[PDB]
């Protein structure tokens, strides 16, 4: 309860520059990807999809 009321001080005033700047800090930052990991999670997306479609389809 003390949390849910601890949010009680008015939504702060904004400024365009700061928000644009943070989301820019989310702009280009490095093409660092691990092909084995992305391939493994791809395989699991595949198995999830296949298992599910076989489930409901029941054929």
């Amino acid at each position: 309860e003390l949390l849910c009321i601890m949010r009680l001080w008015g939504h702060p005033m904004l400024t365009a520059s700061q928000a644009a700047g943070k989301v820019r800090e989310s702009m280009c930052a490095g093409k660092v990807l691990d092909f084995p990991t992305i391939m493994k999670t791809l395989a699991f997306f595949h198995t999830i999809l296949i298992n599910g479609y076989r489930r409901k389809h029941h054929g």
């Binding site: 990807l33 691990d34 092909f35 084995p36 391939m39």
Partner: protein, 35 residues
């Protein structure tokens, strides 16, 4: 028999091929392991 001898000599060139292909497989896994 002489011709069978010639065939036999090449049949183990196959064993080297088998080894090279096994090496190629380990390499290809290396490529996939390393991005």
């Amino acid at each position: 028999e002489t011709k069978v001898d010639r065939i036999l000599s090449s049949q183990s060139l196959i064993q080297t091929i088998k080894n090279d292909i096994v090496g190629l497989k380990a390499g290809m896994a290396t490529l996939e392991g390393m991005i």
